[PDB]
């Protein structure tokens, strides 16, 4: 979708707020820690999201003012809520009342439960991961060195096909293999893996700037066409 999340190439966002890494704290509020636990806690169990495609579409679907103001783990809270409600793990009404309760009484005690077997589950996710590499029967359409042109497409659902790289010549730098396809996986439409490629683009083709800058981008096969 062409949302405010797709910022590559935009102007006006201002200077980068450099901070020395040893001053760059991870979390300043306990709920940002909570967001991390909710995302990996759920994903490790296939709740709301079996991987990051569904997690990413919830963020992209946020209202633009929320996206630019929530702070970062506010994105994560949003997508957790969106996906849990959307798969019917949680009821919308039920979630809004409970939110209202912690808005009005932020001291309400959290109930406590210990489930060591769940801990084990969650550790499996952290250590094993969720590699999207798959094997398919079809052969790659493109080869290393080949000049391609990326499509002029504007999917209204989720893609990994950034606007700045749409309708551009580039050259295949690598054929990774077939990976789960984000444009369908995000919407629960099947893994339907496709070959993934790394693609090199010159600054002149992207921007009209002639200078020694290059961008490398991983693009699924269906985003591109032969010349």
């Amino acid at each position: 979708m062409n949302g405010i999340h797709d910022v590559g190439g935009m102007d006006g966002f201002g200077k980068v707020m450099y901070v020395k890494e040893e001053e760059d704290i991870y979390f300043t509020h306990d709920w940002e820690r909570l967001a991390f636990g909710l995302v990996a806690g759920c994903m490790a169990q296939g709740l709301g999201m079996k991987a990051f495609d569904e997690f990413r579409i919830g963020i992209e679907l946020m209202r633009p003012v929320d996206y630019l103001t929530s702070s970062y783990y506010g994105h994560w809270i949003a997508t957790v809520a969106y996906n849990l409600v959307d798969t019917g793990v949680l009821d919308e009404k039920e979630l809004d009342e409970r939110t209202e309760v912690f808005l009005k009484k932020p001291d309400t005690k959290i109930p406590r439960r210990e489930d060591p077997a769940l801990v084990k589950l969650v550790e499996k996710a952290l250590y094993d991961g969720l590699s999207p590499l798959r094997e398919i029967s079809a052969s790659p359409r493109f080869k290393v060195g080949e000049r391609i042109k990326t499509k002029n497409i504007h999917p209204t659902g989720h893609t990994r096909f950034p606007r700045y790289a749409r309708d551009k010549y580039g050259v295949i730098d690598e054929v990774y293999g077939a990976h789960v396809f984000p444009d369908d996986a995000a919407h629960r439409k099947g893994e339907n893996p496709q070959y993934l490629y790394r693609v090199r683009f010159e600054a002149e083709e992207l921007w009209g700037y002639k200078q020694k800058d290059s961008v490398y981008i991983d693009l699924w096969e269906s985003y591109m066409e032969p010349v």
């Binding site: 901070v19 991870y26 909710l38 939110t99 959290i110 109930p111 800058d213």
Partner: protein, 202 residues
């Protein structure tokens, strides 16, 4: 709030806090989550993972030329043999800075970053200014970090649009003669491994 303009009004941060607490509470009551599952995750990301893992790989590459070469040929194998593997670190590539090629990495679409090797991303890395600008004017973005490259060094920016992740192997600086693997690893900054900084002589 005028109901023609609800899009003008963001959720306050207090809303995200409350939502977070509501979701925790609902999930614990229904048996989807426990207290210790949440705290295991938090322990992993806040304390177990860090840039010290990439720093060990960088110093190894610098002191062991056979390993540097294995790493650049097949980083997914080598890194996985070292234990640096996991959620959002299943396919990690290492891209080598040389005298005339400088690499920098970004996730223009969100914040993608190889947790198992480098820990949690910088604050700025996840924010629009850096995401928007670095792919179009990497030389200006780098100058704000104190890195002013000559016109004759090529910049390759690597956008993490898939689950493939990238780490930068920075050049060993001058002035580090005779120091050991472990000593050199303390020189390796988080920023040099994103490519927004070179490593200073000590």
């Amino acid at each position: 709030i005028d109901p023609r303009f609800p899009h003008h009004h963001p959720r306050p941060q207090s809303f995200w806090e409350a939502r977070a607490k509501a979701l925790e509470s609902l999930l614990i009551e229904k048996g989807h989550l426990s207290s210790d599952a949440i705290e295991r995750v938090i322990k992993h990301y806040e304390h177990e993972l860090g840039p010290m893992n990439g720093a060990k790989v960088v110093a190894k590459a610098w002191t062991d030329p056979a390993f540097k070469q294995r790493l650049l040929e097949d980083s997914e194998t080598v890194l996985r043999e070292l234990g640096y593997y996991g959620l959002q670190g299943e396919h990690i590539r290492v891209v080598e800075n040389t005298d005339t090629v400088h690499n920098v990495v970004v996730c223009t679409l969100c914040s993608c970053y190889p947790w198992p090797l480098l820990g949690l991303p910088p604050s700025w890395y996840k924010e629009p200014a850096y995401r928007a600008r670095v792919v179009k004017e990497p030389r200006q973005v780098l100058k704000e970090f104190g890195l002013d490259l000559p016109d004759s060094v090529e910049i390759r920016v690597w956008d993490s649009s898939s689950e493939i992740r990238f780490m930068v192997l920075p050049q060993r600086p001058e002035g580090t003669e005779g120091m050991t693997e472990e000593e050199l690893a303390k020189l390796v900054t988080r920023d040099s491994m994103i490519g927004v900084a070179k490593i200073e002589p000590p």
